[PDB]
Design a protein around this ligand. Structure first.
Ligand SMILES: *[C@@H]1O[C@H](CO)[C@@H](O)[C@H](O)[C@H]1NC(C)=O
Lengths: 50, 50
């Protein structure tokens, strides 16, 4: 009684449209544009009304 | 078997054979793949359009 069970879940943001057979490299080299705000910080807008 | 030299000389072999070979192979493969892709690249309407 044999039973494989495989999962997989990539979750990328953001580079070149991901696909399973992609190397861990051609991802990187293809990051020239396709940049994404991974972290951000700002102020409450009432502060800017001066 | 049987023999005699006076009244009772005979022969007998009531040989018998009963064989019953039963096989029952039963194979059941089951495969089930599911795989789903998503991309986004969002778009907003400018706050001052007409
Ligand atoms: C899947 O089942 C096969 C046998 O059909 C086994 O050799 C293998 O290790 C299992 N796992 C993967 C990831 O193939």
């Amino acid at each position: 009684y044999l039973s494989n069970r495989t999962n997989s879940r990539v979750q990328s943001f953001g580079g070149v449209p991901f696909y399973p057979g992609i190397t861990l490299e051609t991802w990187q080299k293809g990051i020239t544009n396709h940049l994404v705000a991974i972290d951000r910080a700002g102020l409450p807008l009432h502060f800017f009304i001066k | 078997t049987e023999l005699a030299l006076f009244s009772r000389v005979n022969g007998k072999f009531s040989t018998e054979f009963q064989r019953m070979k039963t096989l029952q192979v039963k194979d059941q493969a089951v495969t089930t793949r599911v795989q789903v892709r998503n991309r986004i690249y969002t778009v907003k309407t400018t706050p001052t359009s007409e």
